Amino acid sequence: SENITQWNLQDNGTEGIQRAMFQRGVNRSLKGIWPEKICTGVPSHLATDTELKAIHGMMDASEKTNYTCCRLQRHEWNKHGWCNWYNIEPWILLMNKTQANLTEGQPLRECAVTCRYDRDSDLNVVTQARDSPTPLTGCKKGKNFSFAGILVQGPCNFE
Numbered sequence: 146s147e148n149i150t151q152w153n154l155q156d157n158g159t160e161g162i163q164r165a166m167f168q169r170g171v172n173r174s175l176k177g178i179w180p181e182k183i184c185t186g187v188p189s190h191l192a193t194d195t196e197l198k199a200i201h202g203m204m205d206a207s208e209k210t211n212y213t214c215c216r217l218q219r220h221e222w223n224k225h226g227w228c229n230w231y232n233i234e235p236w237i238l239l240m241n242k243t244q245a246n247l248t249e250g251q252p253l254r255e256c257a258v259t260c261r262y263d264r265d266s267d268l269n270v271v272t273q274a275r276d277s278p279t280p281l282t283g284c285k286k287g288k289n290f291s292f293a294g295i296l297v298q299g300p301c302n303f304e
């Protein structure tokens with residue numbers, strides 16, 4: 146409940162992962178699961194490409210891996226993983242389930258984080274989202290939201 150889960154949503158309008166997702170027909174790819182403690186210093190365990198590829202469906206945000214694995218996946222382990230989950234297997238298991246739920250198209254609660262306001266469609270196209278509400282960035286006031294196609298009135302989509 147105390148852990149933020151953020152992910153990316155497709156958009157041909159955004160340079161980087163969002164466009165790569167649009168092109169590959171992926172609607173949502175996990176960014177990370179964030180507890181409150183961040184992980185300064187040398188990791189307990191150094192994550193290997195094989196362990197990171199086990200988070201099936203998660204696309205790397207780095208152009209330099211053609212938006213596949215592992216830069217982003219490795220970064221999340223280094224910045225939020227080791228110091229909080231102590232061992233790689235439980236983390237991988239959790240990252241893979243959240244991504245699986247994302248891939249099923251149904252996240253518990255989708256909630257805008259950052260938009261790219263598309264003037265041509267009078268829509269706040271959502272680039273990143275999370276499981277809980279948060280202050281927005283780049284979302285025009287009173288304009289409708291586009292969550293990987295799905296049209297939603299508010300920033301969040303529940304309660």
Ligand SMILES: *[C@@H]1O[C@H](CO)[C@@H](O[C@@H]2O[C@H](CO)[C@@H](O[C@@H]3O[C@H](CO)[C@@H](O)[C@H](O[C@@H]4O[C@H](CO[C@@H]5O[C@H](CO)[C@@H](O)[C@H](O)[C@@H]5O)[C@@H](O)[C@H](O)[C@@H]4O)[C@@H]3O)[C@H](O)[C@H]2NC(C)=O)[C@H](O)[C@H]1NC(C)=O
Nearest residue numbers: 146147148178179180181229230231232233234235236239
């Ligand atoms: C929200 O985010 C928090 C992080 O802040 C997160 O909490 C963490 O939860 C993980 C589990 O998901 C938990 O990790 C365990 O830590 C204990 C020690 O406290 C370990 O024992 C566990 O490892 C397990 O044990 C193996 C080794 O131990 C022995 O070996 C045998 C045989 O292998 C095992 O069967 C036995 O367990 C035995 O004891 C390890 O090698 C394995 O990796 C195995 O999994 C876990 O690593 C952390 O303690 C929590 N930390 C905090 C700070 O809360 C929480 O899940 C998040 N929740 C949500 C919903 O997102």
Ligand SMILES: *[C@@H]1O[C@H](CO)[C@@H](O[C@@H]2O[C@H](CO)[C@@H](O)[C@H](O)[C@H]2NC(C)=O)[C@H](O)[C@H]1NC(C)=O
Nearest residue numbers: 238239240241242243244245246247251252253
């Ligand atoms: C993935 O989705 C399923 C289905 O929405 C989640 O399962 C529910 O979890 C709640 C806990 O808040 C339980 O009360 C329900 O019993 C579960 N429902 C079903 C149908 O299993 C699951 O928690 C999600 N997993 C992750 C990792 O986010």
Ligand SMILES: *[C@@H]1O[C@H](CO)[C@@H](O)[C@H](O)[C@H]1NC(C)=O
Nearest residue numbers: 165168169208210211212213
């Ligand atoms: C990047 O991935 C896509 C889809 O998997 C592919 O069409 C493209 O050729 C890849 N490779 C490079 C080097 O761009």
Ligand SMILES: *[C@@H]1O[C@H](CO)[C@@H](O)[C@H](O)[C@H]1NC(C)=O
Nearest residue numbers: 199201202238241242244245
């Ligand atoms: C990862 O989840 C996928 C579904 O995306 C499933 O094929 C596999 O069982 C899961 N792997 C692990 C390590 O649990």
